[PDB]
Design a protein around this ligand. Sequence first.
Ligand SMILES: *C(=O)c1cnc2ccccc2n1
Ligand SMILES: *C(=O)c1cnc2ccccc2n1
Ligand SMILES: *C(=O)c1cnc2ccccc2n1
Ligand SMILES: *C(=O)c1cnc2ccccc2n1
Ligand SMILES: [Mg+2]
Ligand SMILES: [Mg+2]
Ligand SMILES: [Mn+2]
Lengths: 8, 8
Amino acid sequence: XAXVXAXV
Amino acid sequence: XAXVXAXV
DNA sequence: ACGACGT
DNA sequence: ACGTCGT
Ligand SMILES: *C(=O)c1cnc2ccccc2n1
Ligand SMILES: *C(=O)c1cnc2ccccc2n1
Ligand SMILES: *C(=O)c1cnc2ccccc2n1
Ligand SMILES: *C(=O)c1cnc2ccccc2n1
Ligand SMILES: [Mg+2]
Ligand SMILES: [Mg+2]
Ligand SMILES: [Mn+2]
């Protein structure tokens, strides 16, 4: 849920 | 019902 | 009744 | 280095 690199 | 990973 | 990620 | 959900 975080998007720091993916942002699922 | 939400789809944040599944979206049922 | 439903599970996922990459720069 | 980063965590989330409601019909
Ligand atoms: C988002 O909050 C979150 C938490 N855990 C995960 C695990 C695997 C893929 C994506 C994810 N996203
Ligand atoms: C984004 O591509 C990515 C990959 N690995 C991680 C590890 C820990 C926190 C965030 C990350 N983001
Ligand atoms: C969607 O709103 C919702 C709420 N609760 C659930 C529980 C189990 C599976 C799917 C669900 N979807
Ligand atoms: C999606 O794959 C997934 C898995 N676990 C969760 C927990 C809480 C909110 C959203 C979620 N999404
Ligand atoms: Mg990875
Ligand atoms: Mg709920
Ligand atoms: Mn986590």
